Amino acid sequence: QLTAAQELMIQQLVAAQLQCNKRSFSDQPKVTPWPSRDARQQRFAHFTELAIISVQEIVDFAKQVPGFLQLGREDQIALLKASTIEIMLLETARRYNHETECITFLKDFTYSKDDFHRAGLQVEFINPIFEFSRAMRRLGLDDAEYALLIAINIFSADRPNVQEPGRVEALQQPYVEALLSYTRIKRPQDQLRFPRMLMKLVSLRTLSSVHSEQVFALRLQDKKLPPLLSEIWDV
Ligand SMILES: CC(C)N1C(=O)C(NC2CCN(c3ncc(CC(=O)O)cc3Cl)CC2)=C(c2ccccc2)S1(=O)=O
Ligand SMILES: CC(C)N1C(=O)C(NC2CCN(c3ncc(CC(=O)O)cc3Cl)CC2)=C(c2ccccc2)S1(=O)=O
Ligand SMILES: CC(C)N1C(=O)C(NC2CCN(c3ncc(CC(=O)O)cc3Cl)CC2)=C(c2ccccc2)S1(=O)=O
């Protein structure tokens, strides 16, 4: 029941995500290794360097999402600035292993709740990250669903400083429609899976606020973010 346009959109997004992720994995040897003052700073550096790799992946993917380059440069910046943390959280949830209760980045960097704390994050942010990851795991999302949810997230008309919210909302719609059609085909008996997925976008907005509080807390400790992350996250 997918239309040709929908099938093409989905296959292209999944392929784009795969290709962008292959370029991130090539960057793995760069990151400061995971291990004392030196050790504490090394753990923090490791996490922020993984984040830089993630930001570069997100930018690379966004460029390949149909419609994104039709937006003005200022709106591209506004949307990605707000979306970045939320996409990172989706990608974090995607990498969660329930058996070990650990998250795996770049194939072989695996971290528990306590490792997140040792990297310099607050329990007020870590606990909701892991709750969100558990909730996402329950949905059993496939590559198509993750790709579509990310596209939907990017085209959020209500982000601060968006100049053309009407255009953004119009570009979002086909991805919402595609996800509706896809989920109705994949699980024709589970009608509540689709709304539960969209409710995760609601959770992401809350997590963005919790993340902003985390960023503020680092400022008081003056743990300084690298320039890319500072530009996107610091006030
Ligand atoms: C490399 C990836 C991203 N590329 C593509 O994925 C793909 N799309 C598919 C088009 C139809 N397509 C199909 N999809 C689902 C089904 C569903 C079932 O099995 O019934 C059956 C088929 Cl044939 C195969 C390839 C491409 C393409 C589209 C149009 C013209 C030329 C290439 S591309 O190279 O840009
Ligand atoms: C503010 C500084 C301290 N913060 C951070 O430094 C950071 N680092 C992580 C960013 C996401 N992350 C990723 N790494 C690699 C990839 C690429 C792949 O694994 O293929 C994908 C992801 Cl999501 C791990 C490190 C954060 C974070 C952690 C969990 C969820 C969301 C954000 S934070 O914002 O608290
Ligand atoms: C606030 C200012 C300093 N900030 C920034 O300047 C900027 N850089 C932009 C440069 C790369 N990127 C793009 N540029 C051009 C194009 C257009 C084409 O390629 O033809 C398409 C894209 Cl995605 C978007 C973000 C940011 C950014 C970086 C990564 C992720 C999200 C936001 S920020 O908000 O910290």
Numbering used by the authors: 219 to 253, 260 to 459
Sentences from the study reporting this entry:
The liver X receptors (LXRs) alpha (LXRα, NR1H3) and beta (LXRβ, NR1H2) are members of the nuclear hormone receptor (NHR) superfamily of transcription factors that function as heterodimers with the retinoid X receptor (RXR) and activate or repress gene expression in response to binding of cholesterol derivatives or synthetic ligands. Transcriptional responses of LXRs are known to directly result from ligand-induced conformational changes in the receptor: similarly to other NHRs, in the absence of ligands or in the presence of antagonists, LXRs form complexes with corepressors, while binding of agonist ligands forces the C-terminal helix H12 of the receptor to fold into the active state that creates an activation function-2 (AF-2) coactivator-binding surface. Reaching isoform selectivity by rational structure-based drug design has proven to be difficult since the ligand-binding pockets (LBPs) of LXRα and LXRβ are virtually identical. Since the adverse lipogenic effects are considered to be largely driven by LXRα23,28, drug discovery efforts have focused on developing LXRβ-selective compounds.
In this study, we compared AZ876 with structurally related compounds AZ1–6. These compounds have a central cyclic sulfone amide scaffold with lipophilic substituents on both sides identical to AZ876, except for the tert-butyl substituent replaced by a propyl group in AZ1–3 and AZ6. The third substituent from the core is a larger elongated amine linker that is different in AZ1–6. The amine linker is mostly lipophilic with a polar group at the far end. The compounds AZ1, AZ3, and BMS-852927 have the highest affinities of 2, 4, and 3 nM, and the compounds AZ6, AZ7, and 24,25EC have the lowest affinities of 161, 105, and 133 nM, respectively. Analysis of crystal structures of LXRβ LBD in complex with WAY-254011, AZ3, AZ6, and AZ8, as well as of previously published crystal structures of LXRβ31,40,55 reveals that GW3965 and BMS-852927 are the only compounds not forming a direct hydrogen bond with LXRβ His435 and therefore they do not stabilize the His435–Trp457 activation switch crucial for the agonistic conformation of H12. Other agonists form shorter hydrogen bonds of 2.5–3.1 Å essential for proper position of H12, which correlates with their activities both in LXRβ HDX-MS and functional assays. Overall, most of the selected compounds displayed similar differential HDX patterns with a strong protection from deuterium exchange observed for the peptides lining the LBP: central part of H3, H5, β-sheet, and helices H6, H7, and H10/11.
